[model samples]
Target chain A: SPGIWQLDCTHLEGKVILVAVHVASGYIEAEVIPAETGQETAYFLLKLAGRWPVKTVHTDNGSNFTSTTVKAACWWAGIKQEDGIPYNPQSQGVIESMNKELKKIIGQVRDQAEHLKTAVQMAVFIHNHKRKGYSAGERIVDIIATDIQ
Target chain B: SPGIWQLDCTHLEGKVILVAVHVASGYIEAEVIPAETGQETAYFLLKLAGRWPVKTVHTDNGSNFTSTTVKAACWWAGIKQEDGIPYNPQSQGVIESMNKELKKIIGQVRDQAEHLKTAVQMAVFIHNHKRKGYSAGERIVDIIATDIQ
Candidate 1:
């Protein structure tokens, strides 16, 4: 569920590319390959995570998410690939929350006077560190402030 | 762009609605109006500002944003309406940032064990107060300390 990856959208001119975030940690990575197709997604994931260990990948069963390449990669890496129910997100709960967080960060970043970089960096940093959520009548983790730089 | 207006969405059941926002204040509103046709934009604008005086309405000319109704509302409110180029967000610069903030807040709320309403209220309160930013190079109001019970 965790690894660095590149989101290449050079081919997706004009259309806005949607990326996902980890809501609990504000840990983000983009869906670099466009159209959510199988082969492209597989290529993107493998390419993005150039040399990282991806233990498990949970995703929607879009063509890209369910493609053979992605499956093969998961098998090769000894990673388990799980799919969410069709047209639903219950199975990919962790990443869905993350996607929401990422969208929020992206929106915030797009609103600044400066380029998107500053707002994005700050937002991601703060989200992963400062924001806190209650888990069991107590703060489970200081998400933004704890794990990330 | 802060107002609440309910509209009929019978025909546009599954359309992706765009809710533009004010970046600095995190004020946002949504419209179920069509992207093209540019009809009833003024009505949407009127609803977006229920009771507040709109000094200026900033947006892009996606037809809907540049409709006669939108123009009329701005005229009637003694407000100035400005639209940016199709792709450039220079005019509505703060929207994306506001969206990001909203997204983060939503994530914070969703991660909580409490009900959605409670989580949202808490997230909204924190977003309005805790996150620090430059506004006239001075600290803005503390929303949580001031508003929360």
Candidate 2:
């Protein structure tokens, strides 16, 4: 996931918006955080609960991902953490590509939007609704239906 | 060199810093940008001109680094840009190691420092002054002396 925000505006600058994409269903979750620390990472992970089953998560070897608190959180959730090679983008290719598209979508309407968060949320909705010929909402429906059975 | 800075106050919080390390002499340069963008990448490159000799630069294939404006800036400076493989950290091992050390240094005194920028500057100075069993400053002095000869 990539974080985007205004670099120049006083109030908006330094605000980090994070995006997390579910590779299997193409579902995307996004959040805006005041900072980019392990606490935020844990918060984002917690937000994913009930929506998706916890298994394994892959990320770069960023300190935030490697911090003890984040590791403990993942363990508590029964999820394994896998760190990609330090400088390799391909290790997280799916999300990397998603980030590119997400940035493009956000860039187009950023200036006109009432808020940066809204612009990004709109982009995520568009991304998940149609990705790789799959309907994320449809997939979620199927998952729910299968569980009900 | 690029710079990374934390957008928030805690050790496990808002940590984003960019760094550029010279492989040959172990010299390190770092900065904190308002955002990660092609414009900021170009600005960082320009700032390096008077400080270090521009020859070739190596970086991960981040959007900011691969953007057209950044490419054009490198071309204008007669510097070749070498991109690391997408999932490979070893391609940028030198700087990767430097980043680890930089973070450690910052973590040690982040709370006591009046400003994050100042703490990082002190860390960079300490790193460049001594690394890999050699003095970066001494290596620069030797290069200058050889050129005079």
Candidate 3:
């Protein structure tokens, strides 16, 4: 039940941002690139698939998410990509939460460190593996069965 | 300005936890024990002082905190002790924030894997050093300093 990834530009540094969140597990992953061109977006999506086993993918109807290249990758991966209503955000709740949490962690890190981006990555890593309500009171590996579900 | 130390059963299993927080730094040290007894609290306080340079301590009029043994230890160490109103939590706000932040990080770690304690320690280290603000644009350390004077 992982959710769709959202674009975060608060600290992008001129990079295209893609964030993907797993709804059931509260696990999130994000990527930054120079552009969201069809090829780049498709490449990122494909890279994400290699990291985690995705079944049904959902997204807003952004041109990047709807690009032919992305569609082909999804089709090849046997992923069912669903596009939400253009302006309706209910479908992107998980990603929205991810954005909020990531921003919070990033901000917290920036408060203590000189380099915000590196601190953000550390915070993200901690967030993904740390226990949450969805994590069932255990870390990622311990709750894998539930997270994967 | 120095912060307060509150003895409570937060981390210790059925024991008192000696919590020390630096007001300006937002740094925290927690020592878990099995009792709120004076001797136990003093020993833990000594343990905590070994790791931190504490000049003043704040607590409510909890029996253990006002115990003859704890008072003696503080007096001998030349550490000033200030008691808070039983219901007023404002005096221990630094430790409270530390607890909340610690819980958030621990919750995240426990969601990931085993070694929850280690994960929490690492998170604490990161929280102290990370430059993230407590809020979107406000840094905790700087804010605390600015609050004073």
Candidate 4:
């Protein structure tokens, strides 16, 4: 079923890397932004809408996500918003760990913009195809794009 | 229809980066190997077979591609082989440029096995999702995953 998606951001070379992961399938979309503004977060949400069915957006109470821009974007898109306590991994650990994972992957490379951009793209592919720890060794894309055994 | 695919290899920090591009769709699969042997190339072919239907394989006359290992893999898989002249990009230019592109993306990172591995995986995601220079900015995944207008 098309359902809730959790969103988060991590820093890389003074840039914000936004990540959204589908709760059911673990399918994710990532974007590297210059800054974490509500406008930027809204655009990222729109990007997902263009590709997949987005119903609810679950996000921590970050200022960018809480800004009027994001609220309006969600309201306009007909997406429901569910807020979680900030700094509480238990609420959204799935995507939080993903944020860390993205950092770690990019961390392997030099702290250069060009490399980080490429690393983000690479992380997306590897993360999607690789077996997830929480998903019992099943690849994220295979789970959603295909079916469960 | 599932048709011809091209294979190429480039060295990164003494590691052989094996790449295969689907001639028709531009879909590619890459692997980082310790050596570029016919055995490695053949195994790469097998990897593609597990996920997608592969028919003819088009490659330049590289020793690793011509070895008995690759020959048997093709014959056993019931796949047809088409040979191109070495150093003649005109014959298999579709994938030759892809090899260069992969190198450029990976070049952004520091020279480390972990970074390269992640970069290769990243390149797969980025190359597949980003617009291809040859394909007029049409994202590879969008084109293959969906029909062209």
Question: Which prediction has the highest DockQ against the true structure?
Answer: 4
Looking at model 3, residue B36 earns an lDDT score of: 57
Clashing pairs in 4: A122-B122
TM-score of each: 0.31, 0.42, 0.40, 0.45
Better of 1 and 2 by TM-score: 2
Cα RMSD for candidate 3? 18.5
Of 1 and 3, the candidate ahead on lDDT is: 3
Taken in order, the candidates have interface RMSDs of 18.6, 25.3, 19.0, 11.4
Q: Which of 3 and 4 is the better model by lDDT?
A: 4
> What is the C-alpha lDDT profile of model 1 across B75-141, one tens digit per residue?
6445566654425545334544554665566565575423433333333344433435432101211
Model 2, residue B104: what's the lDDT? 89
lDDT of each: 0.40, 0.53, 0.51, 0.61
Q: Sum up the clashes in candidate 1.
A: 23
Question: For residues B55-132, what per-residue lDDT tens digits would candidate 4 score against the true structure?
Answer: 777764568556887786676455677674546656456556777787887776435224455567546644655543
Q: lDDT per residue, candidate 2, A4-91, as tens digits?
A: 1101001234566675555455566665577767756764554343123445666434685578866865664456766644255553
What TM-score should be assigned to candidate 2? 0.42
Highest TM-score, which number?
4
What is candidate 3's TM-score against the reference? 0.40
Please list the residue runs of candidate 1 whose C-alpha ends up more than 4 Å from where it truly belongs after superposition. Answer: A1-26, A31-33, A47-52, A86-100, A111-126, A133-149, B1-149
Judge the docking of candidate 1 as incorrect, acceptable, medium or high: incorrect
Q: Write the per-residue lDDT of candidate 3 for residues B80-103, one digit (tens) a residue.
A: 776655455574574466667766
The TM-score that candidate 4 achieves is 0.45
Instruction: Give chain B TM-scores in order.
Output: 0.48, 0.75, 0.64, 0.75
